[PDB]
Design a binder for this molecule. Structure first.
Ligand SMILES: CC(C)(COP(=O)(O)OP(=O)(O)OC[C@H]1O[C@@H](n2cnc3c(N)ncnc32)[C@H](O)[C@@H]1OP(=O)(O)O)[C@@H](O)C(=O)NCCC(=O)NCCS
Ligand SMILES: CC(C)(COP(=O)(O)OP(=O)(O)OC[C@H]1O[C@@H](n2cnc3c(N)ncnc32)[C@H](O)[C@@H]1OP(=O)(O)O)[C@@H](O)C(=O)NCCC(=O)NCCS
Lengths: 415, 415
């Protein structure tokens, strides 16, 4: 008996900008974004590419690529911090756009960039409890990250959606139920009050909160993983025994910071830690070999899209399995989800034999291939457009766009 | 092995108005609100009684009244359609105000008035999956219903919060896991776009959607309950074999409509339905005897508070068990949750032997006793106050209020 992620699909906005064009535009050394942050291309949106449209594009693509029977979906959850109504959830819009049947729970989950994982766990545990046996769930992480012109967070902006298929046939990731570690605390590192279109953030403080919550979540998982015989204090650090580790990527260089911190948790908690110094522990924790073996190949997609909040971690999982699904089959990997506010959860799972099949059907290269580069000038023009003023452009085949808001009702079109 | 609701607590705003004062103020026949809608008293708020403050008051009261060990809480979820941030969830605020520890998931669930049930099921199935074994969850339904001055929905306004304790010791309601019926569809019956403080609603269309979604959800549950031997087609209709049925109460008279519809589902689907007429089926479905035996005693609290969206159904459960917990111990009851947008879920559970104990510790009479009546004139003045302008009044002991918003950070005080 297994449960977890069976397949995934992703949707991206139709436009992007080269990150070095953004630096030049802002009077910033390009190397700060490319080397300092690890960014290559930044997704940019117009009002037509809203949370619903992206979420529905991704979920409709999942059902098509993986040949999902819509009537087997018992749960449709949208994790997002870019909601479009205080009451009506994006999930209900997605249900209608996809013409899905009625025998399913629909709702949205919210906690910054952790909201997707929260919905994933609710779907997993709905199945694992037996309530969802014989059925599947679809959990969509959909967000548009917006910090504003001339802000420190601008180069980490992005947008898109990742639709996750959750079932008793977890071809991508059979998750280890009950082993999750979690760490949460009331903080103001990043937030976006109602009515404000741009987020508020204490940049370097959100990094500290990330690493603090990460440490607690990983340690919680490690304890449970030790008792279940999945890892051990041996010649290898417990975290080294995971084939790969994927982290929430607000920006690509954040994955190296997170991996260093995770390994420090092992080195500081090792029974022989007294024999080491902070200098020796940091040099070992920063091991380039460990980062290359465990993390480096998970950032290909994230570097060309930017921050997608709830979807960043699962874009990393996607980048990782896009190329290494076959090699990772039967191997256990770890995932760290973070949400400003804040909450972190660290969980593990085993990649399935059929993972390569499911990722090939996701055809991620073709998803990224359909985008077009625009100028910073055009990016800014689209940014200033009001949320109810989509561009008069058609969606791609099978994709969705917002067309207008009439009498407070949102209208959408399918390509 | 059992799982469900162990205990509950409720918080109410400090003010209310007599509903007949509202009618007189609006040039409406008082009997329309009292007889037509079933309302007695309508809760009213000032900006200090926001979603966080009400949610934190209820959850803090739960922990105190039921002597909960905060470090056993592994999940804290807030169901609400009155969010105060696009990113930071009410749950994270509640965590900080209550000074809870860190080993717990926090997030908000959204789907109109169904959002609390969604979070409840996520907590239940987290435990039932084994992931939450040995721990408890707290699910808070917190909302302020606001339609605006001189609107058709104004007399159904309200506010408050119900905090639910979810554990493997479901003293109030050991829920039948896996038997839920559910029915959802993309509709615009009721919604509230971002930035709009008052809800939009097609009144009588939301009633139809309620009854349509109810019918599907109940039928789904009934099918599963028939196969599990919990109900049977006998001299009694399947729905009659439930000791009680609690429904989402947007207004009190809505419970009679819902109960009539539920019974019609039985009468229309009965193998001998061909021998009946619509006239005979409606007269039997409207049975006053059945409504009095199954539903009537669940509306005492709702009638003095008004619509609390996510919390209305569980205020009904509270009113029911407040007086009949002892008699209902060992008996199975049904619950219907509705959320505009829309989604309905019907589920069942068995009242526990210790339910009367837990309800006595909730001391609901004293909760309602602390309120004060105000004038419609004062109600309107408080209504026009901006969300960031709380009244300079102290919270009650153990309760919380919003005090101000400084530099986009919300500040709260504990009484
Ligand atoms: C991430 C963020 C905090 C950084 O912005 P900043 O404060 O303007 O950038 P910094 O001053 O920290 O510079 C970033 C890095 O690039 C480096 N850098 C700067 N100029 C450089 C250059 N010319 N060549 C190479 N590297 C350079 C810096 O040394 C720094 O390195 P380090 O991380 O290894 O120390 C900001 O983009 C932000 O707030 N983002 C939004 C929130 C977020 O994503 N938070 C993450 C946690 S969830
Ligand atoms: C509920 C709501 C639709 C009713 O408002 P309304 O349209 O102004 O009221 P109606 O015209 O339907 O009148 C309501 C009832 O009171 C009765 N009534 C009116 N005047 C009366 C009087 N003087 N004496 C006795 N009864 C009276 C009506 O006959 C009607 O009865 P019925 O329900 O049994 O048919 C409105 O309050 C609303 O939109 N509420 C918000 C959304 C909501 O709660 N929806 C519920 C589904 S979630």
């Amino acid at each position: 008996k297994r449960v977890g992620i069976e397949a995934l699909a992703v949707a991206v906005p139709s436009r992007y900008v080269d990150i070095e064009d953004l630096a030049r535009a802002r009077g910033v050394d390009p190397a700060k974004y490319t080397a300092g942050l690890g960014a290559r291309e930044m997704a940019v949106t117009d009002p037509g590419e809203d949370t619903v449209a992206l979420a529905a594009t991704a979920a409709a693509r999942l059902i098509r690529q993986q040949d999902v029977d819509p009537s087997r979906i018992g749960m449709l959850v949208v994790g997002t911090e870019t909601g479009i109504d205080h009451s009506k959830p994006v999930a209900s819009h997605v249900q209608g756009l996809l013409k899905l049947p009625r025998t399913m729970r629909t709702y949205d989950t919210q906690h910054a960039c952790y909201g997707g994982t929260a919905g994933l766990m609710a779907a997993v545990e709905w199945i694992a409890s037996g309530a969802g046996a014989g059925k599947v769930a679809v959990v969509v992480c959909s967000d548009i990250a917006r910090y504003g012109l001339n802000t420190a967070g601008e180069p980490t902006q992005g947008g898109g959606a990742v639709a996750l298929l959750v079932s008793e046939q977890p071809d991508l990731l059979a998750m280890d139920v009950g082993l999750n570690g979690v760490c949460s605390m009331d903080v103001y590192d990043f937030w976006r009050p109602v009515g404000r279109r741009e987020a508020l953030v204490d940049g370097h403080y959100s990094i500290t909160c990330y690493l603090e919550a990460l440490s607690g979540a990983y340690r919680g998982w490690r304890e449970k993983a030790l008792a279940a015989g999945l890892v051990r204090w041996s010649d290898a650090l417990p975290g080294e025994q995971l084939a790969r580790i994927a982290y929430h990527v607000p920006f690509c260089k954040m994955a190296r910071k997170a991996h260093t911190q995770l390994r420090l948790c092992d080195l500081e908690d090792a029974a022989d830690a007294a024999a080491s110094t902070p200098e020796s522990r940091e040099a070992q924790a920063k091991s380039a070999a460990s980062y290359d073996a465990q993390v480096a190949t998970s950032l290909g997609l994230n570097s060309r899209i930017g921050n997608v909040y709830t979807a960043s971690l699962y874009l990393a999982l996607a980048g990782l399995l896009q190329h290494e699904a076959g090699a990772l089959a039967g191997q256990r990997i770890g995932l760290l989800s973070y949400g400003s506010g804040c909450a972190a959860e660290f969980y593990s799972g085993t990649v399935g034999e059929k993972a390569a099949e499911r990722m090939a059907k996701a055809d991620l290269e073709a998803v990224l291939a359909r985008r077009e580069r625009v100028s910073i000038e055009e990016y800014e023009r689209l940014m200033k457009l009001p949320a109810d003023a989509p561009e008069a452009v058609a969606p791609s085949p099978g994709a969705f766009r917002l067309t207008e808001i009439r009498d407070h009702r949102r209208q959408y079109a399918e390509g």
